[PDB]
Amino acid sequence: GSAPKYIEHFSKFSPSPLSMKQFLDFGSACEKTSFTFLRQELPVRLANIMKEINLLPDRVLSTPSVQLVQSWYVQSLLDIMEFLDKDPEDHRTLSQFTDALVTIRNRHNDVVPTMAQGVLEYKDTYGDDPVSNQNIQYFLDRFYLSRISIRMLINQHTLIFDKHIGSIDPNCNVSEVVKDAYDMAKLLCDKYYMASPDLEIQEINAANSKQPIHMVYVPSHLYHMLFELFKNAMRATVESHESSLILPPIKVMVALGEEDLSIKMSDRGGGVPLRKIERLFSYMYSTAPGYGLPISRLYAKYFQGDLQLFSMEGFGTDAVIYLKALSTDSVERLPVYNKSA
Ligand SMILES: CC(C)c1ccc(COc2ccc(CC(=O)NCCN)cc2Cl)cc1
Numbered sequence: 001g002s003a004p005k006y007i008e009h010f011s012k013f014s015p016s017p018l019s020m021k022q023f024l025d026f027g028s029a030c031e032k033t034s035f036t037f038l039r040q041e042l043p044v045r046l047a048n049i050m051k052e053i054n055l056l057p058d059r060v061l062s063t064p065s066v067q068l069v070q071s072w073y074v075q076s077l078l079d080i081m082e083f084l085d086k087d088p089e090d091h092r093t094l095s096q097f098t099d100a101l102v103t104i105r106n107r108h109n110d111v112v113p114t115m116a117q118g119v120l121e122y123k124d125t126y127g128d129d130p131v132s133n134q135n136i137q138y139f140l141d142r143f144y145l146s147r148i149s150i151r152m153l154i155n156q157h158t159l160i161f162d163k164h165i166g167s168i169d170p171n172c173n174v175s176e177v178v179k180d181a182y183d184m185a186k187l188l189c190d191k192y193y194m195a196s197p198d199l200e201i202q203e204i205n206a207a208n209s210k211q212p213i214h215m216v217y218v219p220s221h222l223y224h225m226l227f228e229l230f231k232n233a234m235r236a237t238v239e240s241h242e243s244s245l246i247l248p249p250i251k252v253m254v255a256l257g258e259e260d261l262s263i264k265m266s267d268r269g270g271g272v273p274l275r276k277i278e279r280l281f282s283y284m285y286s287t288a289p290g291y292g293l294p295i296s297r298l299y300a301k302y303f304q305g306d307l308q309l310f311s312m313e314g315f316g317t318d319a320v321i322y323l324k325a326l327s328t329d330s331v332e333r334l335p336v337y338n339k340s341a
Pocket residue numbers: 056057060065066115116118119122131132135136139140
């Protein structure tokens with residue numbers, strides 16, 4: 001077959017990063033333009049990460065988990081090829097493309113636990129030394145960020161072409177998503193432990209005091225990040241206080257600046273020594289017989305944000321999500337192939 005040829009052809013192109021603005025217009029332009037963009041751009045993004053997978057050393061590349069994930073990418077690339085010569089004016093071309101995108105999305109659903117098996121296998125077969133750790137961290141950050149960007153493109157297409165513009169809410173109420181993610185974490189926390197800390201939210205709209213804080217964002221991404229952080233802050237708070245009676249609340253601040261929308265989650269869960277912070281973000285060190293924090297950080301990075309942890313051992317932990325306030329500064333952050341090693 002031609003998969004290596006295709007990979008070589010499309011890995012010559014740079015992925016084209018889109019802004020929120022571009023994303024919002026695509027969901028007014030129309031389906032034909034999404035189709036002609038995506039039938040080029042998906043092969044480009046697939047091929048760029050496939051090329052990088054093929055550069056892994058043989059002792060990683062040869063493992064069943066990587067071979068299995070590589071086989072999903074090959075089929076998904078081939079599924080998209082079928083449409084390169086098809087006619088955009090034919091509505092059967094367009095419906096079949098949508099169908100093809102849903103199968104591709106479904107096919108890749110189990111990538112994270114599959115890659116996690118790969119990490120486990122490597123720790124036991126070759127070890128968990130600091131250089132292994134950096135190479136795993138380097139690869140998976142790029143792999144998972146690539147995969148977030150491909151799921152975004154596919155989600156935008158399948159949701160728009162069946163107020164919100166697919167996965168984008170142009171009037172996202174940040175405090176409402178905070179309360180949703182808290183309410184869900186509390187539910188699980190109450191079930192597993194006999195208790196759950198309360199929530200306090202404070203907003204700081206610097207320029208418009210007392211105006212509720214809204215942004216253009218992908219609320220499912222924001223939920224994913226906040227949910228992960230709530231789980232961590234609830235587990236720490238409950239477990240560090242199980243001989244105490246009082247349960248300090250979790251305090252969230254939502255700050256809107258000129259360019260940053262910042263969400264701090266402050267807990268009193270006893271904290272982590274500085275030495276152990278790096279490990280919480282490490283796929284390798286956080287793999288035991290992917291993970292929430294490292295992948296939540298990629299969601300934040302995806303539109304030029306970040307996710308930082310600062311703890312005070314003996315007291316508690318601050319987690320901050322940094323987002324861009326402005327749709328104009330919210331541009332896909334994409335890993336690009338070439339330079340290497
Ligand atoms: C996520 C899974 C599948 C996974 C598991 C393990 C790895 C680890 O990959 C390593 C490990 C060590 C080195 C040092 C070295 O030898 N450098 C030169 C390269 N030979 C390089 C790489 Cl790319 C990546 C991804």
